[PDB]
């Protein structure tokens, strides 16, 4: 990506000067955006889950691996050995493609993007964005599952302190309230 | 009057398996002799000592048996068969 080179150049200079970091790679660098489209209807309407997977494929370019629960609950009809939920973890070139595509096309199409920040970091530097609906993503045809869902896009960073992670988001211009 | 008496419900016990150490430290031993019968490895195997389908330690060569305490906080026991090592 040309903006990937832009990422290299821009993040280096500004971050380096903002805290006098003694090495250029001391500045934080983002590693992987995990996507987790999991649904419990696969216990009963298994067919539904299959269609789900294809949409995840169509959004990222990586086929989603379906995850299995580590316990069993009767109230949720859950039992061990079943696959309920797919997770995808993008790295290298593809994750930055998805990140830019999210912030510029998918994200500002959100029905009411008022945004949410400062109250999302987990205390170790991560960040989760809870999307409400899937239809807003461009890579999905009108024909879909009879049920509509959201997303659980999350973020990670090399640093463990939340303030420098916030600094990376501001340097990347991730559009949230005051952050 | 006898008044009658109740009935007991637990009077069953199994044969006592004769586990424990068989060959003591310092004892001469030939190959193929059992050194320790156990339920679960209470004494680890070392050099010249084998294992069976019942976690029974048996020798693999001639020599003198020797127990050595090892492991975290010296809580694990290990057995070995120090060969004769006569070496003229």
């Amino acid at each position: 990506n040309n903006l990937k080179a832009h990422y290299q150049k821009t993040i280096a200079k500004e971050l380096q000067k903002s805290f006098a970091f003694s090495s250029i790679m001391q500045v934080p660098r983002l590693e992987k955006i995990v996507i987790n489209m999991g649904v419990g209807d696969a216990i009963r309407d298994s067919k539904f889950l299959e269609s789900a997977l294809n949409e995840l494929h169509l959004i990222s370019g990586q086929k989603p691996v379906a995850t299995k629960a580590k316990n069993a609950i009767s109230t949720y009809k859950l039992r061990a050995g079943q696959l309920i939920g797919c997770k995808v973890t993008l790295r290298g070139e593809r994750m930055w493609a998805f990140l830019e595509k999210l912030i510029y096309v998918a994200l500002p199409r959100v029905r009411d993007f008022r945004g949410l920040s400062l109250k999302s970091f987990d205390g170790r530097g991560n960040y989760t964005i809870g999307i409400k609906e899937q239809i807003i993503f461009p890579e999905i045809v009108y024909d879909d599952i009879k049920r509509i869902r959201g997303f659980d896009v999350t973020l990670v960073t090399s640093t463990n302190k939340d303030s420098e992670a916030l600094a990376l988001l501001r340097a990347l211009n991730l559009p949230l309230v005051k952050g | 009057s006898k008044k009658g008496v109740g009935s007991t419900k637990n009077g069953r016990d199994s044969h006592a398996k004769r586990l424990g150490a068989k060959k003591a430290d310092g004892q001469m031993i030939r190959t193929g002799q059992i050194i320790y019968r156990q339920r679960g490895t209470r004494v680890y195997p070392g050099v010249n000592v084998g294992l069976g389908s019942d976690d029974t330690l048996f020798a693999l060569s001639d020599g003198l048996v020797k127990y050595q305490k090892f492991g975290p906080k010296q809580g694990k026991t290990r057995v070995s068969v120090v060969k004769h090592k006569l070496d003229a």
């Binding site: - | 009057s1 006898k2 008044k3 008496v5 109740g6 009935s7 007991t8 419900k9």
Partner: protein, 136 residues
């Protein structure tokens, strides 16, 4: 009637009272204590009798601690029953008191009342009691 809420085994082996003093040997909550001089089995009924007696002769500001507790139960075969057919059913709970264990302690009321209070507590118990004070 002091009683454990639940126990793992209904019928345990009895616990011996011969020997020295294991724990509860020195006054450490109050400053006067009723020490024992003869190991014996004393049940929760005697605790309640002694505790109610002491409490009645206590005042409005005195405070008390109960050290011993009847952890172990004891059985009794029903009357007119011949030997055999298993162990009896648990009947009453007893605390094991060894020679030297401090059973009751008192504080926060003048000196004369506590000696009398400990006296009536010890007259309710079979063990031969004796008064001790707390080390400075």
């Amino acid at each position: 009637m002091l009683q454990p809420k639940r126990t793992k085994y209904r019928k345990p082996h009895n616990v011996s009272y011969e020997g020295k003093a294991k724990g509860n040997s020195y006054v450490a909550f109050g400053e006067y204590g009723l020490v024992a001089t003869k190991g014996n089995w004393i049940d929760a009924r005697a605790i309640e009798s002694a505790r109610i007696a002491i409490s009645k002769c206590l005042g409005k500001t005195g405070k008390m601690w109960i050290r011993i507790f009847p952890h172990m139960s004891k059985t009794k075969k029903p009357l007119e029953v011949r030997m055999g057919s298993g162990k009896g059913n648990p009947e009453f709970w007893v605390a094991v008191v060894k020679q030297g264990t401090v059973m009751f302690e008192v504080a926060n009321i003048p000196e004369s009342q506590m000696i009398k209070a400990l006296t009536r507590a010890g007259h309710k118990l079979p063990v031969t009691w004796k008064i001790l004070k707390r080390e400075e």
